[PDB]
Amino acid sequence: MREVISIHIGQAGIQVGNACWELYCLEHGIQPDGQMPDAFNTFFSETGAGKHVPRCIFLDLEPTVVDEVRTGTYRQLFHPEQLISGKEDAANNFARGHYTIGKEIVDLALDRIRKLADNCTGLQGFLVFNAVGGGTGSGLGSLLLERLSVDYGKKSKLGFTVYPSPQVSTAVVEPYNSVLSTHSLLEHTDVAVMLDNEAIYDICRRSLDIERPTYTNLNRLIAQVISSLTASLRFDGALNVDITEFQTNLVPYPRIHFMLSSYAPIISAEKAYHEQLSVAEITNAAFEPASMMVKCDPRHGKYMACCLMYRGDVVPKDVNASVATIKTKRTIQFVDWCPTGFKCGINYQPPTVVPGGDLAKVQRAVCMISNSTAIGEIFSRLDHKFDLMYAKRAFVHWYVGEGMEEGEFSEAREDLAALEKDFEEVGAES
Amino acid sequence: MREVISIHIGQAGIQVGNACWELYCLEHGIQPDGQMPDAFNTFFSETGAGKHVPRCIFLDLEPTVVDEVRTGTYRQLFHPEQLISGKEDAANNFARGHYTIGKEIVDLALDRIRKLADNCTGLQGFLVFNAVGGGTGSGLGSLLLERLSVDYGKKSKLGFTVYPSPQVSTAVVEPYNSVLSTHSLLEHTDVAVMLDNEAIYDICRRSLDIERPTYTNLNRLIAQVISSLTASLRFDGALNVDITEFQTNLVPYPRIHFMLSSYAPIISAEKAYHEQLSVAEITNAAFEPASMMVKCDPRHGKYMACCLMYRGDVVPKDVNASVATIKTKRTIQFVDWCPTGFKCGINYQPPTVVPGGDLAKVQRAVCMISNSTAIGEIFSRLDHKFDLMYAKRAFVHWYVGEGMEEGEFSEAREDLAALEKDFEEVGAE
Amino acid sequence: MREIVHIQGGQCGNQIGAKFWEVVSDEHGIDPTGTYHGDSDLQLERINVYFNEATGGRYVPRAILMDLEPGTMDSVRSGPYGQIFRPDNFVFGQTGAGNNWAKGHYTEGAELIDSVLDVVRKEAESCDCLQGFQVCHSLGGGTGSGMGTLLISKIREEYPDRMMLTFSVVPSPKVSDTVVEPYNATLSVHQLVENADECMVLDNEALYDICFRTLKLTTPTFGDLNHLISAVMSGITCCLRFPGQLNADLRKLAVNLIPFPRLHFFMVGFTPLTSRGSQQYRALTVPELTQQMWDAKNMMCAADPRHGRYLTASALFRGRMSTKEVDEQMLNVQNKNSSYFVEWIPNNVKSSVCDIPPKGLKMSATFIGNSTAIQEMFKRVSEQFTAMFRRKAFLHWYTGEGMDEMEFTEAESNMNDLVSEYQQYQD
Amino acid sequence: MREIVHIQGGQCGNQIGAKFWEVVSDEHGIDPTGTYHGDSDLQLERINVYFNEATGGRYVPRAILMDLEPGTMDSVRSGPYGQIFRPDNFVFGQTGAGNNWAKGHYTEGAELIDSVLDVVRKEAESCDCLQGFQVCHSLGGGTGSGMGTLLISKIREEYPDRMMLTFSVVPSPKVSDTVVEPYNATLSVHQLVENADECMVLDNEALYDICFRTLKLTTPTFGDLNHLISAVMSGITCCLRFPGQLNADLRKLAVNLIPFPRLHFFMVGFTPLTSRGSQQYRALTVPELTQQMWDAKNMMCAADPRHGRYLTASALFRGRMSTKEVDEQMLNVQNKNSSYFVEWIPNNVKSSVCDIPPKGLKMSATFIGNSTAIQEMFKRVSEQFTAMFRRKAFLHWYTGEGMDEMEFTEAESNMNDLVSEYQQYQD
Amino acid sequence: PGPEQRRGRQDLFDVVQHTVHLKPQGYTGGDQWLEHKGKGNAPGPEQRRGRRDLADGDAWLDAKGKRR
Ligand SMILES: Nc1nc2c(ncn2[C@@H]2O[C@H](COP(=O)(O)OP(=O)(O)OP(=O)(O)O)[C@@H](O)[C@H]2O)c(=O)[nH]1
Ligand SMILES: Nc1nc2c(ncn2[C@@H]2O[C@H](COP(=O)(O)OP(=O)(O)OP(=O)(O)O)[C@@H](O)[C@H]2O)c(=O)[nH]1
Numbered sequence A: 001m002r003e004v005i006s007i008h009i010g011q012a013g014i015q016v017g018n019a020c021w022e023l024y025c026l027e028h029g030i031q032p033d034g035q036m037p038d039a040f041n042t043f044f045s046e047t048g049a050g051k052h053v054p055r056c057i058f059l060d061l062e063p064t065v066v067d068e069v070r071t072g073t074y075r076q077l078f079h080p081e082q083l084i085s086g087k088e089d090a091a092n093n094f095a096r097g098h099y100t101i102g103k104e105i106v107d108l109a110l111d112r113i114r115k116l117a118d119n120c121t122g123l124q125g126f127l128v129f130n131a132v133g134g135g136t137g138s139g140l141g142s143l144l145l146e147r148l149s150v151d152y153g154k155k156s157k158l159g160f161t162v163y164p165s166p167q168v169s170t171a172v173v174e175p176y177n178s179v180l181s182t183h184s185l186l187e188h189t190d191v192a193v194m195l196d197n198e199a200i201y202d203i204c205r206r207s208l209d210i211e212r213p214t215y216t217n218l219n220r221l222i223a224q225v226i227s228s229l230t231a232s233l234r235f236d237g238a239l240n241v242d243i244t245e246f247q248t249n250l251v252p253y254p255r256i257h258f259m260l261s262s263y264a265p266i267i268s269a270e271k272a273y274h275e276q277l278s279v280a281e282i283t284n285a286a287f288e289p290a291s292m293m294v295k296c297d298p299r300h301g302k303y304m305a306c307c308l309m310y311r312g313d314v315v316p317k318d319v320n321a322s323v324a325t326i327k328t329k330r331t332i333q334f335v336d337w338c339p340t341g342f343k344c345g346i347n348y349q350p351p352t353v354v355p356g357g358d359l360a361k362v363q364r365a366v367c368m369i370s371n372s373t374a375i376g377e378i379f380s381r382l383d384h385k386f387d388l389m390y391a392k393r394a395f396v397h398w399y400v401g402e403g404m405e406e407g408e409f410s411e412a413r414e415d416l417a418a419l420e421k422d423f424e425e426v427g428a429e430s
Numbered sequence B: 001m002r003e004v005i006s007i008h009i010g011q012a013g014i015q016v017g018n019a020c021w022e023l024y025c026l027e028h029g030i031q032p033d034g035q036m037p038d039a040f041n042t043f044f045s046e047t048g049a050g051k052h053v054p055r056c057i058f059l060d061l062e063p064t065v066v067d068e069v070r071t072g073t074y075r076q077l078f079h080p081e082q083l084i085s086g087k088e089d090a091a092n093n094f095a096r097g098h099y100t101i102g103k104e105i106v107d108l109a110l111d112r113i114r115k116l117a118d119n120c121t122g123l124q125g126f127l128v129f130n131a132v133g134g135g136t137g138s139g140l141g142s143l144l145l146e147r148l149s150v151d152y153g154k155k156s157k158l159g160f161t162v163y164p165s166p167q168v169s170t171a172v173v174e175p176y177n178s179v180l181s182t183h184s185l186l187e188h189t190d191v192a193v194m195l196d197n198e199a200i201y202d203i204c205r206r207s208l209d210i211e212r213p214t215y216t217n218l219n220r221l222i223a224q225v226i227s228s229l230t231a232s233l234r235f236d237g238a239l240n241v242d243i244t245e246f247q248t249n250l251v252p253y254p255r256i257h258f259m260l261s262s263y264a265p266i267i268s269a270e271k272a273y274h275e276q277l278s279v280a281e282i283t284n285a286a287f288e289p290a291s292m293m294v295k296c297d298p299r300h301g302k303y304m305a306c307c308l309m310y311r312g313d314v315v316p317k318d319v320n321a322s323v324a325t326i327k328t329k330r331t332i333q334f335v336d337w338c339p340t341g342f343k344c345g346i347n348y349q350p351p352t353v354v355p356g357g358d359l360a361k362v363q364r365a366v367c368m369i370s371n372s373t374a375i376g377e378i379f380s381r382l383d384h385k386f387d388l389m390y391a392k393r394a395f396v397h398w399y400v401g402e403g404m405e406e407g408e409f410s411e412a413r414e415d416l417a418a419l420e421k422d423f424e425e426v427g428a429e
Numbered sequence C, D: 001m002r003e004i005v006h007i008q009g010g011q012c013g014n015q016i017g018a019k020f021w022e023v024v025s026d027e028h029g030i031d032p033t034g035t036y037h038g039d040s041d042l043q044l045e046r047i048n049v050y051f052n053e054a055t056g057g058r059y060v061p062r063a064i065l066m067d068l069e070p071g072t073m074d075s076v077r078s079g080p081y082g083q084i085f086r087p088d089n090f091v092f093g094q095t096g097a098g099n100n101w102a103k104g105h106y107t108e109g110a111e112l113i114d115s116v117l118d119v120v121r122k123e124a125e126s127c128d129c130l131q132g133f134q135v136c137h138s139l140g141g142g143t144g145s146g147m148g149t150l151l152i153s154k155i156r157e158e159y160p161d162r163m164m165l166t167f168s169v170v171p172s173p174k175v176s177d178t179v180v181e182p183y184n185a186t187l188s189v190h191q192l193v194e195n196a197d198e199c200m201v202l203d204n205e206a207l208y209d210i211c212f213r214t215l216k217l218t219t220p221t222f223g224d225l226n227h228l229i230s231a232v233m234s235g236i237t238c239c240l241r242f243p244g245q246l247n248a249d250l251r252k253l254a255v256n257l258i259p260f261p262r263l264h265f266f267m268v269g270f271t272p273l274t275s276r277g278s279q280q281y282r283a284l285t286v287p288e289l290t291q292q293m294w295d296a297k298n299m300m301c302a303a304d305p306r307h308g309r310y311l312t313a314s315a316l317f318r319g320r321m322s323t324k325e326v327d328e329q330m331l332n333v334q335n336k337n338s339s340y341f342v343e344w345i346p347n348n349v350k351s352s353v354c355d356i357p358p359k360g361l362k363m364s365a366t367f368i369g370n371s372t373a374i375q376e377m378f379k380r381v382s383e384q385f386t387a388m389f390r391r392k393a394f395l396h397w398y399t400g401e402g403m404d405e406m407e408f409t410e411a412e413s414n415m416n417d418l419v420s421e422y423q424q425y426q427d
Numbered sequence E: 001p002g003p004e005q006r007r008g009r010q011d012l013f014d015v016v017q018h019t020v021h022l023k024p025q026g027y028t029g030g031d032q033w034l035e036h037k038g039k040g041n042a043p044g045p046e047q048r049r050g051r052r053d054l055a056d057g058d059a060w061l062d063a064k065g066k067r068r
């Protein structure tokens, strides 16, 4: 049986994770206590006499995000041991989450994962959720991904990670932690999907016409991507794309494993009725820079490998027509050596909508996960931020005192520079 | 499948379009909430299940006219993002609507025109609604018509412009805005249709006996003419006359394309019982000098070509008979090189009536859109007023303040002078 | 066993041909669905001339309906006898010609002429061997003129020995239904003098006063006007579809009516026209069918046949009549009217008697007139074209798609050479 | 006594084969529960070709469903006609092929190929005489393209005297459903040119055009496409299952359609397809089926037959048809366009007739074409493969499961060898 | 279930087996020829009229004069 395990590290992983497990419960009919009044095996383990528990662990050094889950309305869903807490947070220090504090909790963390990896009959991958800007996300995320590769080799690590915005970011030391996390994320995860905070702000302001959005509006449509990602494991479809099919069909080289995301129909209740939602209409909007979920312009780079996951009432011909019209549009550009560039997956289940959510029901939906050379713009802009503060050794004495050495910033800069150089040559026309 | 995408620019365009889309929903039976309780495909798009949206955009830099639609009885009809607004209006400045405040809204405007054309299978034309005496109607209309040419090539564009009246006026810089706007819509508009307030208000005073008319009364009878122009696409008949017909059957040269308009039955409710509406009567009444939309005199010039669009119960016999009688009248004279003077067309359905409107339910209708050599009379008078205006640079520091160069004023003066020598030369025997 | 392929073009062609298949269906006993309901066996021997046998007894017509504006075919599809035609034969455009000849001949007729030739060629070998091709259009238009004439040029290119019978509506003398009628008619005639074999010139303003004066109809319409043209097109092929005492097919009328290859434009009259109130008063006899036939009022062309001499005449009589009653009444009209007939051709009038009259008629006849009096109509069209071309009015649309002003001079020369040749044989 | 063993691999083939047993069991009269409920006696002589007798009157198909994912097991099993297969023959994996050709062929297929050769040997030993192995798979995937071609090499080495019918879809020109098609297809064709006796080239986009231009279906699902593919496979073995006037089994097709041992890929078409609006108007006769037979739009392959010359074609006619009327229509197409036919192979076409048509449709035919026009399809995959391989894109996966790049150069060399001999015979 | 059961046509067996005359009349399904409607309709001048006088309110019979 198909089966995936999600580890959620750091506050951003938990707060998104509070929204993803709110989505799968409404989708599969599981009540907050954990009892339904066959497809649930992808995310839920059926426990004993009619109870389903999630296959996720919640680990964070700061308990104050975790105890909202323990005392919330989903207190009876999760196993009590799966919600893992610590004494004090890493507190925006990568040296504290990887060396000082993270070493005590990572030994316990692999123990509960080994319980979930023993309960599976066929394991298909891992779903990491973290933010590279924080100490827990960068530090404990690097340590957990390091130990997972040694323990469970050649398994797919689908790490949905959140990166700082080029313009609108909240933490000062975010450029430092992003570079040190990328040095470990580059060589370990199989598919890493960037999420950007500011791009989702522009999505909610324009398409969802909400002038003042907060984090719980942001994490709902992030959870719409994850449900659209794994809908082929839970529900049937015309063209099933398994999680193991993603990494063999998206990454061309072992080092270029960064991809974007875009959810095409994002409309409110009063917008939906006036809008004639057609397959060609949503497909055109998915490639627009407005509906991209990372703050970058895809016209600058060239798309390299894009996969579309059509959810709902979509026949295999209107995806045949829409993809052809997309390829003939002059704005969208593919790389020369990859003439086949599209993966079309259709799942027959329409997307579920949460009451209180700002999305209305839509019969058809598209999630595009795109490998592009324009991600080099997302990593050069953070390479510029890391260069200025390290030019006079800012904030270094917090990292040096907490276990990490001075030298590790040098090759982390070199490894990120080696990645930007690799991105330019793979987009080079030959 | 036939499709025409109407655009309404400025306050004059929107308020006429409020009366235009009121008539369209009444013809096909569309309720104001957007749902009917096959013929609608030229103006409406069947959205999902049981909902129709208009294929139009109301764009204006002044938000006061747009939100009246958004607060009126048709708030549920139009798509909420098809309606376009702005922070500050052009305010009778052609340089403002073209250069400094109209540029920020035209990028969003074509993004909806792109999506409306992608929703339609075969586009047949564009309907443009403005008055050249204002800021948004002239300035943003110049930006919209020019940018639609480079994007939508060889597609017909009906320009329904309301020109400044000769004797009466509502603004002081109307001769300035009219000359500059005519410089833009001469080279770009495929077919231009002239409207004037005084002749329409003279129509209401004589035939419709309304001694105190307003814009609401004026916009309805303009809307009735435009619905008759596209009635061939909406409904079937004997001689269907689609959009490309008016392009080549009324415009002999690539400059002479400013046409008049006339609607023959303009009769109130109590006058209609005592009036016998025959095709011989109304075709005589269509060519009467009191019945045009523009205050220009027919017999001062000669007609180039005339288009008689007929609606309702009209047999093809009496249109053949009455046109011959029209040609034999010595009061009107045609140009010497066009013996085949007319083009005819008959639709098989009568026009609808707005409930509470002034027009009566008439079984027949004429849409008399004709090309004449008398269009130079309304152009020379606007040319003369601008010449006296520009004698010592009145109202120029406002226009040159907002980016426009002083040389653009004299260039537009030469263009109308080039148009002025065109009509005298072509109409000469 | 001889077959005719029918092609209809534009608003004028489709609406006329819809009434053409209206008359021949109930003449052959065909219901709107396609089944047979006739009470005699004479209808069923010659059905392959205009119909193709389908499974279940259905009969699909040999009609290719073609145009550029898709609104015309919704009219024939919604009308009665509109469910008979093959949907593969429903070939259409979307933009519309817009009454520009060169637009309907070069830009949007180019992509459509490949499609209509695939349908016509598939209909060509569907039968044994074609008797000929019949088309209906209007010369003043843009859909049936610009695209119809290129269709005629290509169908003669691949099928050179096959026949052509174009039923063309010429522009009005008195009024104008489109302002570009003389531009379209002159370019259409320039193509039709080579590729077309027989051109049945019909004019509206001769149809109208037949309805108003001979037929006394107070409210004539296109439903009534097309039915007069439809009654002609059944009468030309009366001997093809039915046995007759003296038969005449398309080639029978081809060798007689055409003295010289350039002269093939005919004025046509349909004989038994009588109003409803005068039905009982008129006696139906062969002499008075002839008297109604030779009147200038009865011709459906605006040219007056008194002003010119008849080069060749052909009358297609239908019904139970004796073969001398048709004969000495043709000797009488050549003797009592000798000035209006050509001296260098003795016995100008060609006869044909068919045994099966149309529905509700005990006797009927159809007239084809090849006279030199039709030159004044062509000179009238030539006069308007000279007036416009010197000042190049309404002409930049035709040059917008590359048809140069040379072709207009070529069209005027071929018009002026043709109108002079009629005058040359008038002397 | 000529039994056929069906094996289905991959998501594409199993969904295709689900529609195959949907149609064949409907043709032979077996209801979803497996009992016989047909009305004819002609279905009850040869059930053994596709089915096995079971205790209690149950009929089980000779099907072996093999896959690396349990997802497509559940899709076939939950649909109609899904219970008919044996529960023991539902062999499947758990990890999934992941659209990796090397994982299907080397790593994950190795732990399963021994399990599926147990099932294939079991079914082959049960039947009296093997007439072939009918495998239905894809070439753009990894489950049926990678693991399926391993099964091709395995059955061919213990069974070297039996035919192989590899029904395989190919990557489409207009769109692309995976991203590793040139890598997947070129390696799968490398295995198919030796071990497979003959192959049937299919694609999605040629079915879409048939579903839209010919059948006028606006919304074709995969069930609509697979029924067009299943209509092919019933026509290949039409003479085996039913008696016929001129019989032709799979070897007789093989000995004629294959002039040379590397030219065994064919382009296939199913003839009688008409839209619901055009059923009542199309008169189906032997000339009408032949006109639809050689039309380029009726081919279920993307190769236009006008580009290449037909080396050998075969006609699988089903129904009560006149023998010469079948043949003279094939003689008509040999001479009306003889430039499209190979000159050094006289009498290119082969006609075989079976007097038991498919249900409801009295006349039907299946076209099998060994044309060199299919070189453009393999040329497209070759130029798509060479573009990716020089930049080594998507290659760190395939080298990971022990499949070195030495084999991938050999795939391109054998790909170019196939198109070289096809281009060699155009001259 | 997919969109096929929502559209209504189930399995294409009718189109393949050419037995469409067994169906209830008006079943468009997914046939583009059947689901075509446009251009509207209007009687106009065809009211209370038909062309029958050739085959034997109008004419000179509708001529009126002075009361007798
Ligand atoms: N999309 C989204 N991003 C969030 C959310 N919460 C926090 N973030 C992002 O996370 C960043 C802070 O880094 P984190 O990894 O969350 O910090 P942390 O998880 O508390 O780790 P420690 O500080 O070491 O305890 C902020 O800049 C946000 O952009 C959330 O609810 N949704
Ligand atoms: N046909 C018609 N014309 C109108 C109507 N209302 C105002 N107008 C004309 O519009 C002219 C003003 O020019 P416009 O271009 O409409 O002014 P505007 O649209 O408000 O442009 P801005 O002032 O820059 O916002 C006046 O001279 C009026 O004659 C109306 O309801 N119908």
Ligand SMILES: Nc1nc2c(ncn2[C@@H]2O[C@H](COP(=O)(O)OP(=O)(O)O)[C@@H](O)[C@H]2O)c(=O)[nH]1
Residues within 6 Å of the ligand: B238, B239, C009, C010, C011, C012, C013, C015, C016, C097, C099, C138, C140, C141, C142, C143, C144, C145, C169, C171, C172, C177, C178, C204, C222, C223, C225, C226
């Ligand atoms: N008799 C008859 N003539 C028609 C009909 N429709 C159009 N016409 C004639 O056709 C001429 C113009 O045809 P038009 O519509 O421009 O042809 P098209 O646009 O090229 O297809 C006019 O002079 C009309 O008299 C009809 O139904 N009956």
Ligand SMILES: Nc1nc2c(ncn2[C@@H]2O[C@H](COP(=O)(O)OP(=O)(O)O)[C@@H](O)[C@H]2O)c(=O)[nH]1
Residues within 6 Å of the ligand: A238, A239, D009, D010, D011, D012, D015, D016, D097, D099, D138, D140, D141, D142, D143, D144, D145, D146, D169, D170, D171, D177, D178, D204, D222, D223, D225, D226, D229
């Ligand atoms: N005709 C048809 N083709 C299909 C169907 N499902 C998938 N395919 C084709 O299969 C290809 C994708 O390969 P895949 O199914 O993943 O092959 P696998 O990896 O061996 O299971 C695409 O080109 C699809 O066009 C179906 O139901 N019918």
Ligand SMILES: [Mg+2]
Residues within 6 Å of the ligand: A010, A011, A062, A089, A136
């Ligand atoms: Mg924290």
